[PDB]
Amino acid sequence: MPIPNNPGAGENAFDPVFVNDDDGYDLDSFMIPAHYKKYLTKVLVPNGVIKNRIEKLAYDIKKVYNNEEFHILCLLKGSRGFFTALLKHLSRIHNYSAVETSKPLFGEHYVRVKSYCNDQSTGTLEIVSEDLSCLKGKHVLIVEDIIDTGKTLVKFCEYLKKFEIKTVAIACLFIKRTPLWNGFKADFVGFSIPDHFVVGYSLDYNEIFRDLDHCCLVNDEGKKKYKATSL
Numbered sequence: 001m002p003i004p005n006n007p008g009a010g011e012n013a014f015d016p017v018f019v020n021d022d023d024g025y026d027l028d029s030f031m032i033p034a035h036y037k038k039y040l041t042k043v044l045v046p047n048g049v050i051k052n053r054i055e056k057l058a059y060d061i062k063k064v065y066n067n068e069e070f071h072i073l074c075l076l077k078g079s080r081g082f083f084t085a086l087l088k089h090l091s092r093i094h095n096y097s098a099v100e101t102s103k104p105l106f107g108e109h110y111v112r113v114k115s116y117c118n119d120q121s122t123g124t125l126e127i128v129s130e131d132l133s134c135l136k137g138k139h140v141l142i143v144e145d146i147i148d149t150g151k152t153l154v155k156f157c158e159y160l161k162k163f164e165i166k167t168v169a170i171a172c173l174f175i176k177r178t179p180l181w182n183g184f185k186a187d188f189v190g191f192s193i194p195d196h197f198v199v200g201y202s203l204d205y206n207e208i209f210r211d212l213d214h215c216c217l218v219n220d221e222g223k224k225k226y227k228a229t230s231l
């Protein structure tokens with residue numbers, strides 16, 4: 001398979017794990033921080049299934065890039081867990097197969113982007129400008145937590161055009177089956193999830209629940225309790 005370079009087309013993407021509308025687990029099935037329980041409906045995807053899926057995504061990425069140098073771009077803050085697990089598994093897969101004449105596989109890079117207040121996009125993407133000129137003529141793999149509206153990645157890929165990057169491919173942990181979706185597709189996708197606001201595995205509601213290990217549905221009491229005053 002060739003290195004993807006049609007950002008938003010997901011030209012050759014394998015189907016993600018399909019999480020059905022009624023899939024999930026009650027809150028007593030797994031360890032949940034006691035104070036979060038009253039603000040969650042259910043566990044949608046446990047921590048362990050997320051980790052197992054990311055290991056397979058790392059395998060899929062290694063199969064595409066083989067030994068070709070690429071540059072992994074973490075979209076902070078929500079991608080932290082996903083990015084961490086991808087780095088772990090890509091490094092292990094690459095370094096386990098390496099010989100003394102091998103080379104490192106990837107560089108690691110960070111951009112902070114922000115657009116949500118409560119459970120809704122403001123429709124403006126804030127980007128913390130660190131000079132990405134070092135990615136000129138490089139293969140770039142964007143690592144993102146979730147595609148929902150598709151506004152973050154459409155706007156971020158437009159921003160990247162100025163740096164004359166060789167290829168842009170997208171790895172995304174979750175894609176949401178929402179009528180808000182603008183059609184933006186990733187090249188590597190973990191899970192297709194139902195239209196509910198998820199929290200956990202670094203995904204927040206107004207900075208709450210990033211530490212929750214499982215992908216869970218926040219209930220209306222949680223949305224009310226932690227509703228933003230500002231922005």
Ligand SMILES: Nc1nc(O)c2[nH]cc(CN[C@H](CO)CCP(=O)(O)O)c2n1
Pocket residue numbers: 078079115116121145146147148149150151152153176196197198199200203204205
């Ligand atoms: N926690 C959480 N849960 C969801 O279901 C979410 N859906 C969208 C978000 C917010 N951050 C996303 C990128 O990190 C925005 C993706 P977009 O709507 O721009 O495609 C989000 N955050």
Ligand SMILES: [Mg+2]
Pocket residue numbers: 078116203204205206
């Ligand atoms: Mg967020």
